[PDB]
Ligand SMILES: O=P(O)(O)OC[C@H]1O[C@H](OP(=O)(O)OP(=O)(O)O)[C@H](O)[C@@H]1O
Ligand SMILES: O=P(O)(O)OC[C@H]1O[C@H](OP(=O)(O)OP(=O)(O)O)[C@H](O)[C@@H]1O
């Protein structure tokens with residue numbers, strides 16, 4: 180294997196041979212690729228159209244270099260709630276808010292997240308502005324999870340060897356195959372998740388990667404472009420369980436949700452998005468609560484897919500009830516306060 | 526204009542807006558593009574599939590940073606004989622040999638060239654092995670052209686500001702749109718040329734670049750992969766004249782050339798390729814001479830097209846006779862000797 184062979188195959192629009200993506204990703208993670216090579220590869224793979232097998236190789240090699248959490252500190256039913264970002268739409272931090280509501284509903288949450296890449300405020304930025312400790316290592320993440328029912332893996336802390344790819348990603352700006360990797364490389368490896376994909380074409384690919392794992396996942400793409408379950412129109416959901424994928428069109432109007440407009444979900448800077456978290460957790464009704472409740476239910480539905488005691492619709496109805504109740508009973512607000520407390524208590 | 530905007534347009538499979546390729550190239554030439562940006566751009570522009578307008582912006586910006594030759598030192602009717610390289614075939618240096626023969630036939634040649642990127646021996650490497658000085662600046666290329674009838678612009682000498690692009694090219698290894706730029710960027714700007722393209726899909730784009738310039742050019746791709754007119758089979762010629770392009774299949778059998786095989790055109794290291802130049806110019810008959818003659822004729826035809834009007838077949842017959850005579854009179858062998866002599870005079 181070599182760069183000329185691999186890049187030549189991609190620029191020729193051919194799928195890679197098994198092991199080539201892994202070789203490439205290992206060169207990148209070991210600091211052995213020149214920046215030009217990283218970029219050539221990220222771009223060529225994007226334009227060829229990565230397959231699930233290739234992305235699984237990239238994510239899998241990327242995980243082999245991640246700091247793991249300690250043994251037996253992640254419950255087998257932990258859920259993640261996270262997206263690719265890059266939806267260009269600059270919303271309030273839907274995934275982050277859903278994650279808190281889900282945790283407050285009794286579901287263990289280990290969230291992967293990062294600073295904003297192109298928006299004004301990303302999940303980690305908002306959390307930080309809320310006073311949640313984002314900079315914790317493996318041991319303290321595990322303690323957060325055990326003591327608060329929620330943990331945050333700050334991607335730059337857990338994936339230090341990814342620094343070369345991350346710098347190239349930043350230098351080129353254009354979204355690539357690398358943009359898929361964050362959501363696929365949660366260092367705690369939870370088995371469930373609600374995973375948002377901004378890129379209509381690549382969500383099936385992400386589902387394919389989850390399919391090869393023992394996962395229960397909803398890969399979601401709003402039909403308006405959100406890497407979240409949207410309230411402005413239908414969403415496409417790739418349901419992943421038992422090694423297979425069930426693609427479906429999801430309409431929240433079936434659950435009595437009013438259609439929103441994108442600008443009603445718009446956010447601002449970190450302090451502004453932190454303010455929107457406090458509003459929603461405090462009971463404020465309206466389009467943002469609706470989106471949060473919708474996505475939190477999505478996460479609960481994925482969790483339920485693990486110990487599969489329920490069908491699609493009933494699971495949605497119970498997820499929605501649990502997500503609403505976690506807010507209305509103050510449980511989400513209480514859980515955030517406890518999370519901040521835990522962080523201040525070292 | 527930004528990288529995110531330009532790269533995002535390309536990854537979306539869209540042709541660029543006018544001026545965007547020029548912005549990227551200026552970033553590249555001024556030292557302002559990061560290696561990662563250069564490579565992303567090269568690759569994205571390649572996989573999207575460049576247009577002549579885009580490659581023309583790239584080349585025009587590149588030319589603007591190049592060292593020019595001093596004024597009124599390049600003849601109105603100079604020709605170039607050069608290809609993209611990258612045919613992966615490792616032949617004897619066909620362009621270099623044809624350039625010598627063309628000049629010996631009385632056509633001023635200002636040749637753009639470079640070392641091997643992928644071959645064992647490039648044009649420049651072989652010229653060096655023959656004792657030709659490849660490292661001259663504008664003033665001396667210009668003198669060489671006046672006194673010998675041929676001059677050689679060593680790409681690295683004339684395009685110093687391309688060093689970031691060139692380092693990226695070497696690092697990534699795979700052909701991109703950058704591989705088209707050398708031939709489109711001769712710093713003497715001859716208005717005619719026989720330009721070889723190893724990439725069948727990009728030959729048309731090179732042709733359209735020359736057409737916008739109103740150059741008289743044959744852009745050629747041997748149907749066997751050669752960035753030269755071939756003797757093993759037919760060639761595709763994009764004929765550039767009066768600002769328009771014609772695609773043609775060309776068959777040398779129609780002039781009485783017999784089908785050669787590729788390994789008959791095989792070369793080796795600089796010294797072996799130098800020995801093959803010497804053999805051809807000494808009059809040795811055979812497969813290498815046939816290909817040198819065919820290619821020299823092609824450039825002579827391109828050169829004749831600098832005016833109007835004539836047509837095709839007679840111009841080829843005349844080109845072929847002219848190229849044959851240049852050798853058999855001893856003129857091509859003598860020209861290389863003068864060229865070598867001129868280089869040796871520099872020291873004084
Ligand atoms: O700047 P962007 O590329 O458009 O992405 C914005 C955020 O979305 C992703 O995380 P996450 O899904 O956790 O954030 P969320 O809470 O805002 O949904 C990503 O890690 C960013 O934090
Ligand atoms: O290493 P490669 O990518 O295969 O390219 C071989 C040669 O072709 C180009 O020049 P030119 O057409 O003058 O050389 P030639 O005399 O060998 O044809 C290039 O500048 C190299 O000298």
Ligand SMILES: COc1ccc(C(=O)CC(=O)C(F)(F)F)cc1
Pocket residue numbers: 292293334335336338339340341342345360361362364
């Ligand atoms: C300083 O070194 C680093 C800087 C940034 C990052 C990331 O940004 C990780 C990331 O996106 C992931 F996809 F989630 F893993 C990692 C290391």
Ligand SMILES: COc1ccc(C(=O)CC(=O)C(F)(F)F)cc1
Pocket residue numbers: 639680681682684685686687688691706707708710
């Ligand atoms: C060290 O500085 C340099 C080294 C190499 C080169 C080239 O290689 C030029 C080239 O191909 C061109 F496209 F014809 F211009 C340029 C500058």
Ligand SMILES: [Mg+2]
Pocket residue numbers: 261262263264272273274275375406407
């Ligand atoms: Mg999100």
Ligand SMILES: [Mg+2]
Pocket residue numbers: 262264266270273405406407
């Ligand atoms: Mg979002």
Ligand SMILES: [Mg+2]
Pocket residue numbers: 607608610618619620621721752753
């Ligand atoms: Mg050549």
Ligand SMILES: [Mg+2]
Pocket residue numbers: 608610612616619620751752753
């Ligand atoms: Mg050649």
